[PDB]
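Replying to the earlier thread about multi-chain prediction with a worked example.

Input:
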Amino acid sequence: LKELDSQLNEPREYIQILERRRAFSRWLSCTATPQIEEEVSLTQKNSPVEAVFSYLTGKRISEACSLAQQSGDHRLALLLSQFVGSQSVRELLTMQLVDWHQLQADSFIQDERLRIFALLAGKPVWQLSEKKQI
Amino acid sequence: EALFQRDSLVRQSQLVVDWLESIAKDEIGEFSDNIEFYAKSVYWENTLHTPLVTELDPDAPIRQKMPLDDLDREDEVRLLKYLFTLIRAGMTEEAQRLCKRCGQAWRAATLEGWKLYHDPNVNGGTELEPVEGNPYRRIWKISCWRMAEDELFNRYERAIYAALSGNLKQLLPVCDTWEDTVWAYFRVMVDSLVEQEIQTSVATLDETEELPRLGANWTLEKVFEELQATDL
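Result:
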């Protein structure tokens, strides 16, 4: 990948590495949409909490936030908006999962919300022994 | 911290709260240690003595119907009244210590979530040791308001939750004094002003407001008229 306007630091490569990742994500979303368009119709007649989890896999943040806000929930829409991949919330999600796994009995939450809460910790099938995405 | 430096109304209103909390503290005196409870060892000791509670959490009483004992209900009411008195006097640390010693972990966690999130690496002004507070202040306030509005709970606990969220009460307001009512009104006005400032500064999220809150804040003349109608 080649950039148009040059920057000050030319020793590294931060804009090209981001552009390549964005292009790869856009290609993966376009390739997975043909198999995600059919799964969203069958999930709408069963549980409404799985729609946000199904739409978040196609690189749709605003589309998932609007669906979470227009369905009775309010905390899920505010939690899914911070999916940038930084820290802070990465440890907070793990702390919340560890608190919900014990303390107040077992805390039987929903299956769709657990995946969305564990995906914001930077590891959905690695640093999550309880809510593993395997 | 920047609001309290810049805004004389918020700062002077807090000095009136601290003053009214000091009066209530002077009235409590040294008597905090002489509270005889019927339970000596465990939460709801008499209800436990009489197995019928499938869950040890506090949400079981709101989910199911009647499943607690009279002694357990009396102990819970006394604990809620003590927590409300401590919050009115201005001893949050003492109330948290008492809750932790009694065994009210959920109550302690709900009371410790009153402070907002303050990171020492991001905020260079008030750089401390570790990051404390919760980033979902609006969500916590909405949850506290919902818990205070919901029934099947203690009258003192609901009033304390409403006062912590930024609203009024009705069961504990019959025996409240003029100074206590003025302090509650000042606290509600300060909470409304803080919420308005956070909404105008684009600090909270657009979906963090689960329930509708009272955006209108009272002024000095409104507080004076309220105090008059309360205790002419």
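The two ends of chain B are 36 Å apart (CA to CA).

Feel free to reuse this layout for your own posts.
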